[model samples]
Target: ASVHGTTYELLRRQGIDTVFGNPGFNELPFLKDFPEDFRYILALQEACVVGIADGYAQASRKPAFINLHSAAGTGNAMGALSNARTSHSPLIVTAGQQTRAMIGVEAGETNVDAANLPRPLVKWSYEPASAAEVPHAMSRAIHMASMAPQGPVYLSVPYDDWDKDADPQSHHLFDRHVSSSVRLNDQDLDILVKALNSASNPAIVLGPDVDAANANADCVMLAERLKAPVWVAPSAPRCPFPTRHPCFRGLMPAGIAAISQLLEGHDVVLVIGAPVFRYYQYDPGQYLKPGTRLISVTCDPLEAARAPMGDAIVADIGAMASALANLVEESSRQLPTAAPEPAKVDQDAGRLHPETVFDTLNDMAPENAIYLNESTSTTAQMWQRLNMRNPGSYYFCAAGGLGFALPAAIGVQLAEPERQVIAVIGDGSANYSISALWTAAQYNIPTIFVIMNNGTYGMLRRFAGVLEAENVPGLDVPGIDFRALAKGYGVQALKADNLEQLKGSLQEALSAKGPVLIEVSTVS
Candidate 1:
């Protein structure tokens, strides 16, 4: 059997029949005889290609397969790779390489350092030594990518190798299944139970991994048993706890001083499935208040080791949460007070407020709708307005990149066709991968794109105030017609200048049979 045939069989057995790619000359040979059962999703650029696959992997809880061109394509995908890595999306990323015969001569399409190009971003990267080894290498990559602390992996294969003969001994590799689980020991669980039971006031911080592991119910039970207030970890990409729960507090601020201040009243803090801290602003201060004890449970050893002030334990987030819920004694402490509902914003008719837009979405969209957000300036409003309870209900660019939401929404809709997918993007951020609209239209993926057109980089403008800097250049972005761009890409487009118009457009979009884009004017 040929290498391509064997490789396809392996991927087929692994239930990966869909591939995402933006093909180039070097990728021609591998894609020549595409299989009947496989589907290829094409993107206009590498960034969108990777971003879409990342969304699919996260939503489906499966390893998504991606193919790219040589070094140039790999370089284009690095930014999106950062998001996938941080979110722990299992992706099997492959790029084509120059044929083996042209290696030493510095060929035009040669990937000079294929293994190192995507370094420090992907969990594993390699180029098979020979055509016969490609199948084995692919097997290893898939297993490693889907293991505990799942993340993206890279493989660069010479284009000519697809036609070469496969190693007969490699057939066993295709049938082999690799799996692993990490759980806390009885002693570890006992220690955690004791700490929670004895604490006067305990608090819990949940991260993206809780939802990723589908442990929300278990986490809720544990929090209720301890009578602890729950706060989503700073800069979290997913909602780990139910926002409507009475014990749920708002998100913690992304600063050392702010976090310590919010945690002041609590004697013991238990952080699960997140880093000890992921701070953004430069507010240097003590890690925690005096006499406060912090404990962390995470699957990533690096996250556990890097925490400055915490008793760290490495274990599966879901298993540990389940065990702790069963063992922890119920507390008589009073439940934390929940914040009152936000007041309604008065409409001006001239400009739309982000709060109004999100509030409307919360009421109109389906209960199971999934949201992909990159509207940096208005994200706080979006989070406050949206009521997210189910696992895999929301996603953001964990690495803070701009182009992820639009393409990722398409992938999310593809992965779960029954659910509606909505993409909320800022005006400045939308241009990074605007061409993704074409793919959504071509495939007829029914995703609703809401562009908050504030006519500037609102986040950067706010940051200028934080820096106390004046007269920043390139902050304002004027004269971009997002509606026209969407229409040109074959997606249905609508423009809303006020609250009523916005709501009407959203209604139309929700009922549309194909992709729709709504550009809503707003204040920064």
Candidate 2:
């Protein structure tokens, strides 16, 4: 029999020290025995609470527990949770519920009836069914959340369940998900290996699920075996390889049109743990140069079913990576040239090209800087051209949602302040959570915000083209001064219109006393 008080003891015994939260009345009983080992983060909003927890888990590469105030709190967190669903950041969230005895009549501040509010966004969710089942449910929650392709899970605690005197000694901490094994039957392996051995320009694109499953080691081995370059799956929630590796190709584009353009010269593409290249729309149809083979490996059967696939394997990426490593003989494909020397620009070219600005930053940026990117148009340009020296160095949009960068950056900064925090956003995305700058400024955290000010939702412009309306109302933003907006929010703001101005501004802000925002105006 596990009471709610004992539940905290179990978590404390497991070294779970932090709780990101906004507590409701029903949750107070569980807080009565709150351990000194556990510190609570006071997030002003529920989205902030959940989003912070996601970042904490990502930076630590471990799961973090969060407590929410039932329906209201859960609803507030939905937007961020959508992002969490894609990012696969492991989090265990507990929400308070009404007393079991009063279920016949609705009580004051009663949470809305949740048929399964958290399940669609999580790997697992449970109410324990009864008090005796509480310990096991919590255990399962933790284990399921940390399993490969890890994401958020939820538990609802009834107010009265706290006093039930159940045993606390039975709790056990589980670590390291058991990696599942799958080998392609001989015929499939032969076909796959043959395709690789015959191609001169072969590439690999790995996804977040592989990272969630700890398949990077195997992925590396496969790349070496085939002497091929590897690109991370587009819009990755986690880093998929050692960026310092010489054969790294960079992140694949999310839009099919652009990705097809980038891959035009390649003879073969092996997509692991992801669909045959996701597009915001179906633009890659018949566009790949004839004779380019697209092979896929994924654990999800549904994912396998949706792809316009050629030869494919429905198996865990880790297992596939390992098996493929053994089947292919050593290859002699030439790797890319040595990395170019980095530089900082001091002059401007026309249209404030995103390429020029990012190249400047990539050259001048120190090794330990971590980027939280929510910039849309510029990032699209960035992914196509920039070289990722290593994985996990870049974080970007997961659910096509805005406002993730501010909270995520705040959480990452708290964990590793020595590493410079660069929070990048488009002018449109910046509007959603610009207030977060105040949080950084108030806490005296050092961060440099690079706001890409195209003054329009440029992604929407591409969308307009898709919809056959190149010039649409309400899609283009107009007449706003981001420098003034940031200054109003307590961040020291600067402006940039060209290479010279951008480089000079970056050098000054990157070493500034506290949080700074540079609004770089871009015409393209």
Candidate 3:
């Protein structure tokens, strides 16, 4: 049988029935006859293709397949690929390489050293040495891509290799494998328990890895048993704990100085699932309060190594969390009191604060709804306003990249057709992948996208304020009507400038059967 046929058959056997890509000449031979059982999703831009597959991989909990044209396509998709790497989305990305016969002369579409093109960004990258080796290369890619600390893996296939003869049985099942869970051994648990027992006030810093491992419940149980305050790590890509939980202390400050201040009262800080800290702005201060002890539990040794000061334990998040729950004695210390809700304010005409929008959504959206957020500057306000009580209901770009929300929402919706998917996006970021709206409309994929049009790159503006930068050109985006843009893409859209209009749009979108875009202007 032909290598291409064997490839498709093996993928189908592995439960991958969809492939995402933007086509080019180098990939056409294999894509010429699209398989009846496998759906091919076309993205206008290569970045959107990777972004969409990223969300799908996370939602479906499988290694997603992405086909790119050649080196050019891979280069165009590098930003989204970088996001997938940081976010730990399991993706098998294949790019077409020039034919093997074009050896003497460098062809126009030739990719020199294709295997190394996506280096350091992908978990593994390879170019099959021969046509007969294609299946083995794919097997390696899939297994590595789906391993612990899952991330994208790359494969560069020669354009002519697909038609070459290969044994179908050679592509047979790569044995399904799972890594053994690492938990805290007795001695480590004893130290952890001892620290928690002795401390007057202990705090838990939760990260997205808990969500990745489906350990939220176990983590919450550990916190409740310890009577400890729980803070989501700064810039967490996923919601690790229920925001509505009484012990929740909100996000840790991104600035080092503020983080120290936030943990001032706590004597012990146990960081779980995330790096010790991921900081943005340079705030000159101590990493932790004086006399405060830091203990870290993480699966990534690199994250542990990079941490400034901490006793790092290498263990799977879910295993460690469950073990801690069973090992630790209940705390006799007083539980921290929950903060009171902010007082309500009168509405300003024709302008909506990002907080107001999130507050309303918190009140209105179904508990099962999945949220994909990319509104960077307004994130703190959104966190304050919305209560994410359910695990697996939230997702964001862990890599701190822009242009992820819209396409990712579509991918999530596709993976879970029964649940509602809402994309909360900033106007500046939305433009980067707005072409994805055409895809949603074309496929009739129903996902509500709420774009916050604040007339500027709000995060950039905030940065300028913090750094005292003047005359920053291109930071202010005066006008770009998202409603019109959505309309041009064949998706229904509404412009909402006031509370009433916003409510009406959201209601219609929620009840509708197809893709909808609501642009909420925050300019008065």
* lDDT over C-alpha atoms for residue 411 of model 3: 90
Model 3 over residues 119-143: C-alpha lDDT tens digits? Answer: 8899899999999788778878888
Summed over model 2, clashes come to 5
Q: Of the candidates shown, which would achieve the greatest lDDT relative to the real structure?
A: 1
**Model 2 Cα lDDT, one tens digit per residue, 341-427:** 334334447547676777877777776677777877666555543445443556665776787887777777766677777777788
Task: State candidate 1's TM-score.
Answer: 0.98
lDDT of each: 0.89, 0.73, 0.85
What TM-scores do the predictions have? 0.98, 0.83, 0.95
Model 1 over residues 112-144: C-alpha lDDT tens digits?
989999999999999999999999999998998
Candidate scoring better on TM-score of 1 and 2:
1
List the candidate 2 regions with Cα displacement exceeding 4 Å: 1-5, 13-15, 31-33, 102-104, 168-201, 210-221, 235-268, 287-293, 299-301, 311-328, 336-352, 384-387, 415-418, 438-445, 476-501, 512-514
- Which order, best to worst by TM-score? 1, 3, 2
- In model 1, the runs with Cα more than 4 Å from the true position are none
Q: Give the CA lDDT, 0 to 100, for residue 2 in model 2.
A: 41
Considering TM-score, which of the candidate structures 1 and 3 is the better prediction for this target?
1
The candidate, 1 or 3, that scores higher on lDDT is: 1
Alpha carbon deviation, residue 225, candidate 1 (Å): 1.3
